[PDB]
Design a protein around this ligand. Structure first.
Ligand SMILES: [Fe+3]
Ligand SMILES: [Fe+3]
Ligand SMILES: [Fe+3]
Lengths: 308, 308, 308
């Protein structure tokens, strides 16, 4: 393939400018340190901008709430050949990593929380800018491979993502994955559709969530910023935190907020779609809660790996 | 005893005034409808006002964020002789209950989510106003029972609550409960301490979380406000949603935000306390995240039941 | 008993908000680090708010000068089973301690200066909130110990302290302690009186005063904030700095600024009081200079130790 493993770092921060300033200054440094490991294959950092309302099921929400929200959630995707690589980068580069993610403590409201995911399905294209399409069309014809010419999925904040949260009834996992996967395939008929993938949580990176034992806890709260908590003081292993009921993420990319709204809305507006999707809805404990997120900074080459 | 069962309804809403207006108008109606069932024994509704920062682990947060937050979370405690009573009140009084909780859809950002809890430990006194203490002191002396004279835990928004979230490593449950319980006992030496209880999640009320199957989902999103989703379209039973890893709530009441800050802070500042509590910290997957919440509207008589 | 040993950290800082912000962020961290030692038994941090004027002996001063002062003095009390424990906590946890107290260099005008004291007399009760008194009255009657029911000394900034400085003529030490001790006993007849204690300086913690030899001095002034001066470069031992003439602190707690003003003023207004106190006044080289200070953050359990 290969389908890499995905770690998603989640945090809530003050939606003021000091926050975006720090992002601008250390976001880069952290991603550079994460690239010190050969298992690292790329990333996709998102900033949550809104919530899909579903009519008025969520009246206080809108797809773009950036102008009215007091906090902002980030969702940072790091891709790995093997999820154990992730844990090991965290351990190897702890003094940089930690002193770095602390500088933004003054802005933290919740987090960090870094669950680990495995990919059940993935239909994600290589990101191209509108300037590349002539040569992409020219290369594929040159090798007689027109079917390999994809939609133009623009990188660096020029497309939106629907990030849907689902918790499944135990024993219902197969019906759910099957119905969702087929929904994501039918989504290819929708205009503005840039790809999607089903994600399944297989554990939580305790060290990435700043979750240590009694000792680490204390160095965490007592830290001046220039000393790290003992990284070996993480009391559990990623898999020990695999949750039951099972938890999924239906990640779907769209051209714009309307393509997203009416494309997804398809499982609600098209009888054909709506009947396949109702099966997924019969297996749910929680969901679907859909966050609208923006792929701001990324290393689009993780996709080069996904498609080898 | 009896230790009742506790259901905690959680929702995030726009922190504007239209929201508090609706609260003022339907909160009453909902609680009245919940009292149509004999299993109902009282309630405790909280509004989240802040977050315990732990120094600057959570720099963007403070114990009182009511002036700067764009959303507000409520935590409504309903008490039951038996948790099955709760599910049955929801079912019996669905047309009122549902049409009622919808009127506040226009203000919803997330929720409702109503997990069910069982009490592992409970040291909660009967709420008294400063005007009652003369007679409470007089009655107990009259029966030669001075030890039964409690601290004055004022009702209706005149005390704060620390609402701590903990997720425990599987197999570590006994060490955690034991260390926490003994911490809550040592907390009686702290000034301003009004009581506490350890809560353990045993499932989720799907009907209280507006979690139906394909069919209900659709009536939920298509509702004009005057029609309910089929309540029998809830696809799972509360216990099927018992989570692993195990999830707890260390609910601790204090006289004020400082008594809370330095009382709890005791597991950090007092060597005696700090060593007992470190054991709880060794069993954690998540936590402790502490929300400061305000017991605004309540039916203090649920406590009369807890202490029989 | 036991009468613990007391170390009092003194510093002058800019009375602007950046200062109180840092207090809010690192004060907690420092006290947490100080609790890593079993000799630590609690603390009492004060912020100076004013000066007792004595009529118009000090005309430019008032009991509350917080609105007009450009600097602010803090007086942080840490309690120890044995004063050597204090020196050893400083040494053991130097990298945290130091990098922590530096972050507030940008706000320092003078200090740190941490003299060590021994208690000659102590009449300090356990701090209770107005919510605890019903149960305190109920427990003591339950054991037939009404004399053990104390005044309500509220914690966390809800009472004032008179911090009086006295330097005694050598050879006059006994007359002074005897007259002062009896004054503090007569003070129990004054309304609003919450306790007191006579303090005697027995040395200075050079490491707590950032007082090193040539070498440390240099690392102190050259520090980027992420490196500590050699802690073994402290050239003297606490006792070598015991001062002659002898220096005392008459620490007296009151309900409010008026109870303090007229309670103390008693050694001036009541003939009975005034004649006992005149003897203390005959042994003085310096004093009495009385600072009004506010017990803002504390670990009231140090008092649990004092009264065992
Ligand atoms: Fe990570
Ligand atoms: Fe309910
Ligand atoms: Fe010190």
């Amino acid at each position: 393939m290969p389908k890499p493993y995905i770690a998603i770092n989640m945090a809530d921060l003050k939606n003021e400018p000091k926050t975006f300033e720090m992002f601008s200054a250390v976001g880069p440094k952290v991603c550079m340190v994460t690239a010190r490991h050969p298992g690292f294959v790329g990333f996709q950092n998102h900033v949550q901008i809104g919530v899909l309302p579903f009519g008025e099921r969520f009246g206080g929400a809108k797809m773009d709430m950036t102008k009215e929200s007091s906090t902002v959630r980030v969702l940072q995707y790091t891709m790995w050949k093997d999820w154990k690589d992730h844990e090991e980068m965290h351990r190897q580069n702890w003094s940089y990593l930690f002193r770095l993610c602390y500088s933004c403590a003054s802005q933290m409201v919740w987090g960090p929380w870094e669950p680990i995911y495995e990919i059940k399905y993935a239909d994600m294209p290589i990101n191209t800018e509108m300037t590349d399409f002539t040569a992409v069309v020219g290369k594929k014809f040159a090798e007689g491979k027109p079917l390999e010419i994809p939609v133009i999925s623009q990188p660096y904040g020029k497309r939106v993502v629907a990030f849907g949260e689902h918790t499944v009834i135990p024993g219902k996992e197969e019906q759910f994955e099957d119905a969702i996967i087929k929904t994501l395939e039918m989504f290819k008929r929708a205009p503005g559709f840039l790809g999607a993938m089903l994600l399944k949580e297989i554990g939580v990176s305790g060290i990435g969530s700043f979750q240590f034992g009694s000792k680490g806890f204390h160095q965490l709260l007592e830290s001046p910023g220039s000393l790290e908590p003992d990284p070996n003081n993480v009391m559990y292993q990623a898999p020990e935190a695999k949750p039951t009921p099972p938890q999924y993420i239906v990640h779907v990319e769209w051209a714009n907020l309307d393509a997203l709204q009416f494309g997804m809305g398809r499982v609600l507006l098209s009888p054909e779609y709506r009947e396949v999707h109702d099966e997924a809805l019969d297996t749910l404990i929680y969901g679907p809660y859909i966050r609208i997120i923006n792929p701001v900074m990324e290393g689009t080459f993780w996709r080069e790996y996904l498609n080898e």
